[PDB]
Each structure stands twice: as C-alpha cells, then as structure tokens.
C-alpha cells in the first residue's frame, strides 16, 4: 500500500484532501522478537487512540467529518483560499499547533456530548 | 463464543448471511510468551485491517453494507438465485477471487471518496 | 596560515553515519483540523 504515500505532502490542503485513504492505509501494519513486537503494539495503540478521538467527536468511520463547532478567528484568520489553495497541511499544522488541544476539547467537551444528549431527547418524543 | 462458528459454511450464501455475527465474534481474541503474543498481535492487526477497509468504504459498524458501485457482469454473470440460493460463500469466493482487488478499489477509489466530498458540499448549503 | 589534518579512528558511529546521513525518521500525524464551510446537520 506504499503507493502515493505522502505524495500530496507538498500539495495544497485542498489537493491533499483527496488522498486521505493513501496515508490512512499506511498507518496500520529473543530481544529482536520483543522490540519489534512492541513497535507493532505501539502502532496499533496509536491508531486506536486516533480512532477513539474521531469516535468521541461524531466522526467515527469518516475521513472527512463536519461538526457544529464554529471556527474562532483567534485560532487562525486566514481566508479559505489562503488555507485550501495556497497552503499545505504541514504549514497549517505548524500554524495551528498551539490550538489543537482547545479545538479537540470543543469537539469532545462541548459538541457531540450535547448532540448525543439531544438525540437521546429527540428519540423519546 | 465458539457456538455455530462456520456452521453455515456449507449453507447457501443467503442462509449463511444470517450468521455473520457468529463468525465475527470468533475473529477477535520466554520464547513461548513471545510467539503466542505475536499471534495475538497479528490477530488484532488483521481485525483492524478489515475494519479499516470497511470504514474506507462507508460500511463502518456494519456487517451488511450497500454501496453505489454497480456490479459488472465481467466479474460474474450468475443470477441472484444462482448466488444466494444455490451457491455457498466458499464457491463464490473462489469464483470472484480474481476481482476482489478491483471491486475494493471501486469501493475505496471511486465511491465513498466521492460520497464524502458530496456530503461535504451538501452540508455547506 | 596552515592547517594539519590527521586520520582519526573516531567511533563506529561514523562509518554508518556516512550512509545514514541522508535518512530521517518521522512519525505520521494523520489527524488534522481546518476551517471549512461544512456544518453538521
């Protein structure tokens, strides 16, 4: 599955959003028989932790997932052309690295929990 | 959970599609402490790789999942009675084994990616 | 005015270093956040 892996790394965020399955397929798989086994276990744990997050936001089973959390201009003020047409994901990740623990909290600690309780309350009616 | 496991293996594909949870529950769980541990890790990795595919097609969390990929008569020309009422899954798997890497590509590389972008574009309206 | 160079035995992390100098190991961070106009239903 090492075909096209990270090929879009230098591409803009828009162009690089059409290759998400290429990278996704490359995330998941005697002292020599222990250290490499630990690496395999670590890879599994890392995969599942990201899957656990995606699930905590209602983004389970999705590579592109939208929510009800507004974008705060204090995180980034760039336009949509300066993000998806004139910037790469590496540059964006560097720009937004100070806010990823805030956004994730809003994804988990505000939305989805409210959405799940609201769905629970709409289903009783 | 080893109750009914593969009992439907000799049954027709239709009859054998009502026992999917029976097999699904049996897929997931000092040199002697390493080799068997590697087997356990391997089983986990195999499980997750199939789960990773099911997710790449929008079939996550489903045992029976439908898509928008048409069936090509070049893959099989048999009718629906000759597949679900007069054939087993072992015979079908042997018949279709030359096409599984084409169908999966259509499931990943054509549909779902288009579906996810279309949903992304319908949600902005 | 002058410089003098001598052979050095170094260490063994010099023979292999001369082959591995062009390789770097990185960890993949597949999960990203970005603004779009897409709102959840």
């Amino acid at each position: 599955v090492f075909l096209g892996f990270l090929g879009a790394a230098g591409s803009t965020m828009g162009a690089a959003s059409m290759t998400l399955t290429v990278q996704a397929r490359n995330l998941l798989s005697t002292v020599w028989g222990i250290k490499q086994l630990q690496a395999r276990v670590l890879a599994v744990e890392r995969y599942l932790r990201d899957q656990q997050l995606l699930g905590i936001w209602g983004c389970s089973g999705k590579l592109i997932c939208c929510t009800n959390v507004p974008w705060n201009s204090s995180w980034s003020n760039r336009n949509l052309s300066e993000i998806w047409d004139n910037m790469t994901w590496l540059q964006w990740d560097k720009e937004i690295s100070n806010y990823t623990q805030i956004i994730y909290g809003l994804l988990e600690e505000s939305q989805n929990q409210q959405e799940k309780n609201e769905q629970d309350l709409l289903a009783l009616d | 959970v080893f109750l009914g496991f593969l009992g439907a293996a000799g049954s027709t594909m239709g009859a054998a599609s009502m026992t999917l949870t029976v097999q699904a529950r049996n897929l997931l769980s000092t040199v002697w402490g390493i080799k068997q541990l590697q087997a356990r890790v391997l089983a986990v990795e195999r499980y997750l790789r199939d789960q990773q595919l099911l997710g790449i097609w929008g079939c996550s969390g489903k045992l029976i999942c439908c898509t928008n990929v048409p069936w090509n008569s070049s893959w099989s020309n048999r009718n629906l009675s000759e597949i679900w009422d007069n054939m087993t899954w072992l015979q079908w798997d042997k018949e279709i084994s030359n096409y599984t890497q084409i169908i999966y590509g259509l499931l990943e590389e054509s549909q779902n990616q288009q579906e996810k972008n279309e949903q992304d574009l319908l949600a902005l309206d | 005015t002058t410089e003098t160079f001598r052979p050095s035995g170094g260490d063994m992390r010099d023979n292999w270093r001369s082959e591995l100098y062009k390789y770097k190991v990185v960890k993949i961070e597949p999960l990203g956040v970005a603004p779009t106009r897409c709102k959840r239903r």
Partner: antibody
Amino acid sequence: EVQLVETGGGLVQPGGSLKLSCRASGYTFSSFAMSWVRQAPGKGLEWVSLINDRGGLTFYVDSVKGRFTISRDNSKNTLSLQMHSLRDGDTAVYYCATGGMSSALQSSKYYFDFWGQGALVTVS
Amino acid sequence: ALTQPPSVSGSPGQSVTISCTGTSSDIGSYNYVSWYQQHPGKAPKLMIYDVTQRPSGVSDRFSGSKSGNTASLTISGLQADDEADYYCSAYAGRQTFYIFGGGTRLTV
C-alpha cells in the same frame, strides 16, 4: 476574458426533447459551479438548474425536476442540459452561467458570476 | 418570486432606489441577495452579490443594502448608459435555490 457560448437551441414540438450545450473559456471550468437560468420572452429571469464544480450534485426547480438533466464534462469544458418532455411553458432564452454554489473549501458563491448570451428554445 | 416594482425612473445625475421585497425564508434569512443589470437584447450582467459587494469592473455608483426582508439597489449619478432592466435574486435554501423578482425597467 471569460466567455460562455450556448448552442443547441431551436424549435421543438410539444412533448419533444432538446439538448443545449454551453462551451466556456477564460477560467478553470472545473473550479466553478454552473447554472442554467431561463427568461421567457415576456418575463424576468428564472433559475432552472444548478450543478456543482465536480458534476456530481444536481439541483432543479420543481417545474423541471423530473424532466431536465444537467451535466458537465470538465475535460471538454462543456456544460449541457438535456430537456425532455418539453412544455409550452418552457419557451425561453436559456442562459448558462458560472456560479451559484461552491465547494466547502471555497468562499461562498451564491450568485451568478458570469453569463453567456443565451440559446433560444421555442416549444410549438 | 420576489416583489419588485416596475417602471422605476430617475433623472441624470440624481439618485434612484430599486427596492426588492421578499419574505422571511429568503431575503430575511440569508445575506445572499444579488442584483443584475440586463440591457434589452443582451444577457444580464452581475452588479451586486452577497448584500453590499460589487464584482471587479463594476462602478461604485451601484450600492446595495438590506433591511428586514427588503433589499435595495441605489444608483447614484445616473448615466444615459444605465437604462436597463434590473433584477434581484436571493438564495432561499436547499429545497429551492434562487428566487428572482420581476424586472424593473430603469430609464434616465
């Protein structure tokens, strides 16, 4: 520099079919959504259909929803409209236009940015 | 359809307002009300988009505004070349999309 040219117009009997085709140049065709808008000889403008930039999402007015098909070929830079079961109420100049929607990764385009000159469709 | 009066007229060098009245589901719900200028015999040209924005190449004499469920086009400094049929349109959701008003034939 942007030019849109409609062709495929003409006189068709009621109940017949007509396919319109809008050629475009001066911009990247695949980067913009396209719409068809019609104007009856004595009326104002009416929106008819909308297709997204990738040609996968199509929208119609109810009066044509089961009769017209909007399609794109992004390699040929060609937009087309297949008009089936033409009614007398469909006589109009049909304009193709650039705009009407955009990708979630693009700024909003809920307007018609560029217009062609229009094909005349007569039903009678 | 949107409500817009016919036969609005001004005078050279003066200001005229073309008022397009809609409902609470379209002009009053989204800030996407465009104005078009169609000379007879020609296709319409885009003059205003969103509420107050102009395409590049369009003179700043064409100023859009919106209040409540009513949108308007103000043309300040009418020219002989401004005689045209003006149209309003608004985005009105996903079940329907663009609702146009009747044309206003503006003379000078």
